[PDB]
Swiss-Prot record, chain A:
GO terms for cellular component: cytosol; membrane. Contains an N-terminal aldehyde dehydrogenase (ALDH) domain and a C-terminal iron-dependent alcohol dehydrogenase (ADH) domain, interconnected by a short linker. ALDH and ADH activities are topologically separated in the compact spirosome architecture. Keywords: Acetylation, Iron, Metal-binding, Multifunctional enzyme, NAD, Oxidoreductase. Disruption phenotype: Deletion mutant cannot grow aerobically in minimal media, is extremely sensitive to oxidative stress and shows morphologic defects that are associated with deficient septum formation. In addition, mutant displays increased levels of internal peroxides and increased protein carbonyl content. Both acetaldehyde dehydrogenase and alcohol dehydrogenase activities are thermolabile in temperature-sensitive mutants. The chain holds residues 451 to 869 of 891 of the full protein. The keyword Metal-binding applies. This is Bifunctional aldehyde-alcohol dehydrogenase AdhE. The lineage of its organism: Bacteria, Pseudomonadati, Pseudomonadota, Gammaproteobacteria, Enterobacterales.
From Swiss-Prot, chain B:
Under fermentative conditions, catalyzes the sequential NADH-dependent reduction of acetyl-CoA to acetaldehyde and then to ethanol. Under aerobic conditions, despite the reversibility of the two NADH-coupled reactions, wild-type E.coli cannot grow on ethanol as the sole carbon and energy source due to the down-regulation of adhE transcription and the inactivation of the enzyme by metal-catalyzed oxidation (MCO). Nevertheless, in the presence of oxygen, AdhE may act as a hydrogen peroxide scavenger and have a protective role against oxidative stress. Forms long filaments, called spirosomes. Forms rod-like ultrastructures composed of 20-60 identical subunits. Two monomers form a dimer in a head-to-head arm-crossing fashion through the ALDH domains. Subsequently, two dimers form one helical pitch via the interaction of ADH domains in a tail-to-tail manner. These units are further assembled into spirosomes. Formation of these spirosomes is required for activity. Can be isolated in vitro in a wide range of oligomeric states. The lineage of its organism: Bacteria, Pseudomonadati, Pseudomonadota, Gammaproteobacteria, Enterobacterales. In the N-terminal section; belongs to the aldehyde dehydrogenase family. Contains an N-terminal aldehyde dehydrogenase (ALDH) domain and a C-terminal iron-dependent alcohol dehydrogenase (ADH) domain, interconnected by a short linker. ALDH and ADH activities are topologically separated in the compact spirosome architecture. This is Bifunctional aldehyde-alcohol dehydrogenase AdhE. The chain holds residues 793 to 842 of 891 of the full protein.
Length: 419, 50
């Protein structure tokens, strides 16, 4: 059995933040808490909510203590602040870290008796509905407001928490942590400088390129993935070169980014996802350009006819990983009227590197400022640590350990994966 | 000879303290460095040297 699960209401467009939070004034809440960053609190972005909320009169406060990664102790102080305050509306603002930080400090606010480890053990993935999760939404509810164009963490039920003492990652994922309302505005994002826009643009590119060809791809998220891929090729370079002098392409890039976030929230992600997580978490690389270096090698990694060494149910559901890449390529409008498969694959993967040219990213990991010593020292620390971190995964070809470090070495030197 | 023996020493010191050998290995691209070299060239002249 397969599903399609979304938040209850997604409101969106340019100039829609103050008119969306009128319905929480009308019904019916009186106390509120805001989770955001210190940086946006230093600027005048957090006052745009509090100034509207205090005119009707509600109790508001700001938690601007969010590190770039959640550290499992910030959320403990946040839960202490929350059950000292007792609110019933939690508004998350930002991108990435404040959203899942608010999710984790909300799930421990509804159940202060549950310990973290049984949450870390009972709940690690979906496709496994054993057995159930405690009832939430009883004394509070969550609103999610995005700022950065390119992530979809306001519609996805995912969270990543880093331990302080051991440095241990913990992913949490079940469909009881999606927010109740997602607000998609474009006025909040008009002054971000390049190339912060290009990072999120390539992040949305990879999230939409992956989630079409997964093995969990049902027919309910194919059309939206193809729509997210269609809406970037006209409006991402125009948003990169000028801005905010052209206030048309930026909001369309923003909206297609949250379309991609809707797309991968049901058919899950792949291997370059966790590889980008570990590559960015170790070298302190910003997430978003890590997979932009990897994605062409991953497309080459999946473009093989049929090596039957680690395949599974190859006559049951999946046609071919080649053919769906060909479908992306000739749907996008990049093909002659008379072609074959491999020519369409080549015309597809020739194009995004020409895009990455003017988006202005380095051509390997070494030009991003990564030495040889610590890289070759810890490559076998990462090579199998990126195997058990849920990949599993919906890779069309099941991988093994020594095939990932081939990608990790071919990317750092600036070569291609061909055999 | 004394001057040469002096500046031969702290290069061996920088060896085992583990620091890169030029600015490029620290992670500085060529484009924005050649863009901003004449900005920094005279701006580091008036700034009290003297």
């Amino acid at each position: 059995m397969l599903w399609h699960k979304l938040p209850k209401s997604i409101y969106f467009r340019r100039g829609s933040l103050p008119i969306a939070l009128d319905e929480v004034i009308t019904d019916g809440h009186k106390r509120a808490l805001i989770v955001t960053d210190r940086f946006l609190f230093n600027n005048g972005y957090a006052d745009q909510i509090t100034s509207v909320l205090k005119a009707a009169g509600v109790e508001t406060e700001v938690f601007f203590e969010v590190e770039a990664d959640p550290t499992l102790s910030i959320v403990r102080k946040g839960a202490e602040l929350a059950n000292s305050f007792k609110p019933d509306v939690i508004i998350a603002l930002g991108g990435g870290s404040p959203m899942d930080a608010a999710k984790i400090m909300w799930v421990m606010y509804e159940h202060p008796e549950t310990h973290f480890e049984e949450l870390a053990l009972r709940f690690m993935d979906i496709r496994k509905r054993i057995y159930k999760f405690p009832k939430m939404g009883v004394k509070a509810k969550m609103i999610a407001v995005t700022t950065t164009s390119g992530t979809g963490s306001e519609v996805t039920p995912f969270a990543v928490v880093t331990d302080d003492a051991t440095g241990q990652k913990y992913p949490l994922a079940d469909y009881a942590l999606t927010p109740d309302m997602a607000i998609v505005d474009a006025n909040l994002v008009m002054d971000m400088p390049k190339s912060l826009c290009a990072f999120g643009g390539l992040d949305a590119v990879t999230h939409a390129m992956e989630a079409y060809v997964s093995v969990l791809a049902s027919e309910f998220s194919d059309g939206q993935a193809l729509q997210a891929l269609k809406l970037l090729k006209e409006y991402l370079p125009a948003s990169y070169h000028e801005g905010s002098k052209n206030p048309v392409a930026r909001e369309r890039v923003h909206s297609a980014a949250t379309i991609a976030g809707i797309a991968f929230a049901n058919a899950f992600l792949g291997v370059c996802h966790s590889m980008a997580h570990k590559l960015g978490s170790q070298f302190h690389i910003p997430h978003g350009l890590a997979n932009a270096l990897l994605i062409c090698n991953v497309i080459r990694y999946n473009a093989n006819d049929n090596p039957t060494k680690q395949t599974a149910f190859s006559q049951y559901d999946r046609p071919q990983a080649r053919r769906r890449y060909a479908e992306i390529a000739d749907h996008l409008g990049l093909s002659a009227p008379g072609d074959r498969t491999a020519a369409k694959i080549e015309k597809l993967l020739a194009w995004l590197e020409t895009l990455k040219a003017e988006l202005g990213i380095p051509k390997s990991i070494r030009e991003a400022g990564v030495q040889e010593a610590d890289f070759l020292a810890n490559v076998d620390k990462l090579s199998e640590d990126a195997f058990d971190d849920q990949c599993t995964g919906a890779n069309p070809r099941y991988p093994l350990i020594s095939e990932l470090k081939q990608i990790l070495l071919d990317t750092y030197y600036g070569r291609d994966y061909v055999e």
